[PDB]
Design a protein around this ligand. Structure first.
Ligand code: SAM
Ligand code: ZN
Lengths: 43, 382, 305, 143, 408, 42
């Protein structure tokens, strides 16, 4: 995937799971609620 | 101004593949203790000349930045980047040591202890009367060439007598005990929280900006000390390729004077101490006392980066007194003439862990650190 | 022990820096301001020999054949003087006062240390200089060639150093102490007098804190130390060898007091605070069975084992 | 142009009193051009141990540093154990330099002559960190 | 003596290697011989003179026979007594002179042979062996207590037959028996005799070892080894056993087959004669050869002089070599020259040749009644020579300087 | 710097704490737990 190409510690899986969604959020950013909610919408 | 180094074919890895892109280093057989092979790394750049290194991998998710820090091992363990080239290690049990003909050498854990209460244990494997070891704690300024404690950047305890070592001097403050080849020594390191450590440093900044400025250029330095955010992280990293491997090269801290301040109220020079900081050593669960209480603080002007002030002074600008998310105390281990010892990180393999819910195993703060790394990798892109 | 035999001179007069019995042990040479007095002991007569020194003199030495007397003076010169035929040679190399001199075993060479920090070798029969060993950083105060080996030469200096030179090459061979460049710069004790044993296996020095030690210079260790139960004058010292096998040391204070120790032991066996009360002791010489002492003032006393 | 072995046997120099400083290194025969005089030999110590020693020597009031640096990690310490090469005094217009030849994986310090040198002349080599050298167009400061 | 006890790491240099002094003798030197100790040097000259140099200054101090009884023609041998007080002399004026150094001015006692002498080897201060030119036998020359007269007997058994053995060219007394003498004749015959010390002398050995002139015979000062120089370009080295009886067993020969040269003089090292020194006659041969004797290998060459070298003496106290040149007549001198050790400027210095890898202590980064004797002598120095025997000191000529005071 | 200043003041602190929570123990909707975590702050 793009996760193991980017190094690998087991507790570095966050790249597989939540990093892109989060990066996708900040660029948008305006209280935290904008991100807090957008963090729910994708899933 | 400067572009990121290109991608290359051995960086790309697709789904079907199973190779692990933290490309492990090539080792060299160094010596043997107790019928176990200890290896040194042969062609990875080790921390030296005030530069620290960390293996990085290709992260296509970042377009501005192209590479992000990754770690070699699955769990927490020694940072193979800051050792002496002659400090070997065994992948079987992660014990470390130097050959029986070598002087003092040191290694630091890969996790940086910033605040809270952290517990772990040292397992000693081979400590004869010719093979000594020293378990202790150190900041980034300490040199892995010297045994932890010979400078004021480190705190350690000796193997024979369990004496205490700081600034190179010995003290018998802890309950005497001489380590045998199977003990398990505990270390509970309590530090104040970052907010309380942050003002202790902003105050130190503010005292130093003008009181000691009423060296030729006061103006520029004062600008630097005002523009000093200790909590917020500004990191300096450039991706380089060293012998077809991929590492991040960052600037590191240098030794300086020991911070002092004159207190008009008591009318005497006082040293700087972290509030309520404590370093308690255990022997098989049973405490032998507090090693230190007044641990020096490290957050911003307490720790100065490597700095080409000749360049920035001429002139958009960087800071000496900046945090790169690697400020704190690393569990340091030192070996002398075959003295070997191991460092434990995960709860499941601690024999005598104290029961408190706020304390965290080194693996926990490791995990807490990786998360803090990738987030900080995130912001820098933007 | 030593009884008292004969006084030899009164106190009044010029300086009396040195005094030595002749190797044959019948005549005693004492010095005054640019004058020299030999004293036959069998008859107690005194003879006056005048030298051409133009300033006070600081040291004496008999030639082994007991017919000459070498004298070094403040005007930078050394002179061999035949007791009978007068002065025979005048050497004239040093650039500073001559403080210590010592003859050879065969009497053909004469070494003379000075305050120019050098040690110069002189060939008597041709009166020309042979060597110059400038291996000190302060006044070279004392030198001695052992009695039956003319191969080594001691040197004591105010720089604190006790070196041992090779006569033939002039190179330093062994030092036993440190100077202002290698220890606490205020911890150097100046040396005042060196003297070998009779067999040349042990070297004996006197520091300017009135400490007298016996060295085994080959290894570089002290084997006996004799302490008094700082100074201003190079007080005199000598090793007495009575026919009784146990030998004795003797030293001197800026008061005219003398102790004598047994060297094999370290216990004091006698003390003489009676004589030389006014002045400091500078010279103590001995012979088969006699001891001669001499304060700075002309007083010179004889004793007998 | 000589094996480091050959340099160990031929000896073109000795020590003797010097006007510059207490002891100095002098030539006994006209060595000329850029040939191997002598190797600077001593105790090979690490960088940190050099820092421990350097303060321990100043503490004892030595006032003289016989420490020659190989590279950033090791230095040759000839204060107490070393060779006569330890007697070369500093000047800013010197007659000698020193380069690092490596033999059998180990670095060694070889002193070459910058210019022709006559007999009974003091070999002299800039230190590259006060000054007592006598040269006219000279740095008055040791640094 | 003691100095050599400050330099030894169990070992010392056993041979000098550097030419230090070149004595410019006014007359041509023909033979050199140190005093028993290295104090003085007797230099026999071509005109008959015998200068005596003081070794501490390299300057002459006397010359023998200047008022009475010097040599009229070239002196060919000088030999000190063990005391250093007397000196034996022999020249082409047919005289064998014996000198008392208390009276260097005049010959103490002399004797005119019937022809020129070759050499004169001392056995005792009063006894010495003489060798004559063109004579079949040597002669033993003995002094009497009524000291004006002399005894001289041929070194031959009562009726020994030596028909065709040649002339007796050189002799050599035994250093440690004091009663055995070796004589080498002209046709290569080696003999050994034994003295009574009456004249009933008896031969103890006879073997033709070569077809050549025996040029010289020398014996290691401990009687273990003996070497022979021959008219053929070869030195022969043997093992000597004397019990009397006598037996020689050949160890090595010595040649320079490439250079094809003869040897003028040979000399041995101190005790067992582990080393052997010699002087070359060949043209352009300006150096002294020195061999080991256990394996007869050429170990070194003494390269000081630039002319033919022709007598040799080796004093084991001063460890110096003396040799006289052919063309210049001067005396060349080799000594041991040890560089100065800087390890002798402080008591805790040490000099080293190659770097030392310091072993780091564990604390590398952390903060009398001995048995004494001051009088008893030492009967040997580090080299093993019998120190503690009275050696002579030639007194300072006080009555000569007081005249020199007036510019001579 | 303006953009970094904004993020640092408000978001950065609680983003780090929420991130290191999932790092010690992981849920199965790690996105949503964080989303819950951030809302609870303001
Ligand atoms: C290589 S050693 C020179 C040997 C020294 N002369 C001796 O007697 O041991 C270097 C030391 O000598 C001193 N030094 C060298 N050159 C000097 C100079 N030109 N003037 C004053 N001191 C000098 C310095 O203090 C230095 O630590
Ligand atoms: Zn200069």
């Amino acid at each position: 995937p793009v996760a193991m190409i980017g190094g690998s510690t087991t507790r570095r899986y966050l790249n597989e799971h939540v990093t892109k969604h989060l990066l996708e959020g900040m660029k948008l950013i305006d209280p935290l609620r904008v991100l807090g909610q957008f963090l729910i919408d994708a899933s | 101004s400067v572009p990121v180094i290109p991608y290359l074919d051995y960086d790309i890895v697709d789904l079907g593949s199973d190779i692990k892109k933290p490309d492990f280093p090539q080792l060299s057989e160094s010596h043997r203790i107790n019928e176990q092979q200890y290896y040194i790394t042969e062609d990875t750049p080790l921390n030296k000349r005030n530069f620290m290194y960390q293996p990085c991998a290709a992260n296509l998710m970042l377009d501005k930045l192209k590479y992000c820090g990754t770690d070699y091992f699955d769990k927490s363990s020694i940072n193979l980047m800051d050792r002496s080239d002659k400090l070997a290690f065994s992948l079987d049990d992660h014990s470390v040591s130097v050959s029986e003909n070598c002087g003092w050498r040191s290694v630091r854990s890969d996790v940086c202890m910033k605040e809270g209460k952290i517990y772990w244990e040292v397992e000693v494997k081979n400590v004869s009367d010719t093979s000594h070891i020293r378990c202790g704690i150190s900041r980034r300024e300490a040199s892995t060439e010297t045994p932890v404690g010979c400078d004021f950047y480190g705190y350690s305890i000796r193997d024979k007598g369990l004496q205490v070592i700081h600034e190179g001097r010995l003290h018998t403050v802890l309950k005497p005990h001489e380590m045998q080849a199977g003990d398990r020594i505990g270390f509970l390191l309590t530090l104040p929280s970052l907010q309380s450590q942050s003002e202790q440093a902003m105050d130190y900044s503010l005292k130093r900006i003008q009181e000691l400025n009423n060296k030729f250029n006061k103006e520029f330095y004062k600008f630097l000390l005002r523009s000093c955010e200790p909590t917020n992280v500004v990191r300096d990293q450039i991706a380089i390729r060293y012998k077809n491997q991929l590492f991040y090269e960052s600037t590191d801290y240098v030794k300086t004077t020991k911070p002092e301040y004159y207190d008009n109220r008591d009318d005497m020079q006082k040293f700087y101490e972290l509030e309520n900081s404590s370093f308690e050593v255990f022997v098989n669960g049973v405490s032998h006392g507090i090693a230190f209480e007044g641990l020096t603080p490290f957050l911003p002007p307490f720790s100065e980066l490597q700095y080409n002030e000749k360049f920035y002074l001429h002139h958009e600008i960087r800071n000496k007194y900046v945090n790169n998310n690697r400020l704190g105390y690393y569990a340091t281990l030192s070996s002398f003439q075959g003295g070997t010892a191991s460092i434990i990180t995960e709860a499941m393999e601690l024999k005598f862990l104290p029961k408190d819910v706020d304390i965290k195993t080194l693996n926990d703060i490791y995990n807490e650190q990786i998360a803090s790394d990738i987030v900080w990798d995130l912001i820098d892109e933007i | 022990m030593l009884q008292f035999d004969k006084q030899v001179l009164p106190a009044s007069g010029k300086i009396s820096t040195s005094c030595q019995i002749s190797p044959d042990g019948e005549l005693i040479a004492i010095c005054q301001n640019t004058d020299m007095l030999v004293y036959e002991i069998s008859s107690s007569k005194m003879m006056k020999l005048t030298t051409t020194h133009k300033e006070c003199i600081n040291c004496l030495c008999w030639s082994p054949d007991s017919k000459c007397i070498a004298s070094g003076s403040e005007d930078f010169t050394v002179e061999i003087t035949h007791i009978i035929y007068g002065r025979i040679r005048r050497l004239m190399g040093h650039t500073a006062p001559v403080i210590s001199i010592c003859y050879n075993n065969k009497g053909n060479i004469l070494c003379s240390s000075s305050m120019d920090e050098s040690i110069k070798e002189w060939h008597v029969l041709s009166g020309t200089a042979l060597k110059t060993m400038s291996a000190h950083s302060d006044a070279v105060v004392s030198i001695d060639i052992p009695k039956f080996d003319s191969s080594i030469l001691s040197s004591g200096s105010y720089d604190g150093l006790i070196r041992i030179f090779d006569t033939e090459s002039g190179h330093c061979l062994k030092t036993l102490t440190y100077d202002k460049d290698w220890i606490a710069e205020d911890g150097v004790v100046p040396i005042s007098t060196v003297k070998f044993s009779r067999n040349g296996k042990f070297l004996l020095v006197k520091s300017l804190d009135n400490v007298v030690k016996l060295w085994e210079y080959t290894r570089g260790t002290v084997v006996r130390t004799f302490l008094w139960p700082k100074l201003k004058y190079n007080c005199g010292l000598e090793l007495i060898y009575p026919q009784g096998k146990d030998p004795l040391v003797i030293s001197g204070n800026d008061s005219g007091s003398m102790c004598v120790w047994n060297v094999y032991s370290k216990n004091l066996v006698q003390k003489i605070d009676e004589k030389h009360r006014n002045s400091p002791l500078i010279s103590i010489s001995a012979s088969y069975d006699k001891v001669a002492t001499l304060s700075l003032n002309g007083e010179c006393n004889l004793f007998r084992v | 142009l000589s094996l480091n072995q050959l340099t160990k046997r031929k000896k073109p120099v000795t020590f003797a009193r010097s006007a510059i400083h207490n002891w100095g290194l002098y030539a006994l025969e006209p060595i000329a051009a850029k040939e191997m005089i002598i190797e600077y030999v001593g105790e090979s110590i690490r960088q940190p141990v050099a820092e421990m020693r350097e303060k321990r020597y100043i503490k004892s009031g030595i006032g003289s540093s016989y420490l020659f640096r190989i590279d950033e990690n090791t230095v040759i310490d000839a204060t107490k154990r070393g060779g006569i090469a330890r007697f070369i005094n500093h000047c800013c217009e010197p007659s000698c330099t020193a380069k690092i030849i490596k033999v059998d994986g180990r670095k060694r310090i070889v002193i070459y002559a910058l210019r022709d040198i006559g007999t009974n002349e003091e070999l002299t080599y800039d230190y590259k960190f006060p000054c007592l050298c006598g040269a006219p167009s000279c740095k008055g400061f040791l640094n | 003596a003691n100095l050599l006890l400050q330099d030894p790491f169990g070992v010392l240099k056993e041979y000098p290697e550097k030419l230090t002094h070149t004595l410019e003798v006014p007359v041509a030197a023909v033979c050199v011989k140190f005093s028993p100790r290295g104090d003085y040097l007797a230099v026999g000259c071509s005109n008959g003179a015998i200068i005596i140099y003081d070794m501490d200054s390299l300057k002459p101090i006397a010359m023998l026979g200047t008022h009475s009884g010097a040599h009229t023609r070239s002196v060919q041998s000088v030999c000190w007594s063990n005391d250093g007080r007397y000196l034996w002399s022999s020249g082409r004026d047919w005289y064998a002179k014996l000198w008392d150094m208390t009276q260097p001015t005049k010959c103490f006692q002399q004797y005119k042979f019937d022809g020129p002498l070759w050499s004169c080897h001392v056995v005792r201060w009063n006894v010495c062996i003489v060798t004559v030119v063109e004579e079949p036998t040597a002669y033993v020359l003995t002094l009497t207590d009524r000291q004006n007269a002399f005894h001289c007997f041929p070194l031959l058994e009562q009726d020994q037959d030596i028909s065709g053995h040649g002339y007796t060219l050189v002799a050599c007394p035994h250093p440690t028996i004091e009663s055995i003498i070796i004589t080498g004749t002209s046709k290569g015959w080696i003999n050994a005799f034994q003295l009574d010390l009456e004249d009933k002398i008896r031969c103890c050995y006879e073997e033709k070892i070569a077809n050549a002139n025996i040029k010289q015979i020398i014996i290691s000062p401990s009687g273990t080894r003996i070497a022979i120089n021959g008219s053929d370009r070869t030195i022969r080295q043997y093992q000597l056993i004397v019990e009397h009886s006598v037996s020689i067993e050949l160890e090595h020969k010595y040649q320079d087959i490439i250079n094809r040269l003869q040897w003028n003089t040979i000399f041995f090292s101190n005790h067992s004669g582990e080393y052997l020194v010699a002087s070359a006659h060949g043209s352009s041969a300006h150096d002294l050869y020195l061999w080991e004797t256990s394996s007869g290998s050429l170990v070194r060459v003494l390269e000081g002089a630039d002319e033919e070298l022709l007598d040799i003496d080796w004093n084991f106290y001063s460890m110096r070599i003396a040799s006289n040149g052919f063309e210049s007549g001067w005396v060349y001198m080799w000594s041991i020259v040890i560089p100065p050790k800087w390890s002798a400027l402080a008591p805790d210095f040490e000099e080293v040749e190659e770097n030392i890898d310091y072993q780091e202590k564990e604390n590398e980064f952390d903060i009398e009644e001995i048995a004494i004797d001051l009088c008893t002598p030492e009967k040997y120095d580090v080299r093993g020579n019998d120190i503690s025997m009275p050696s002579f000191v030639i007194p300072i000529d006080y009555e000569g300087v007081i005249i020199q005071q007036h510019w001579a």
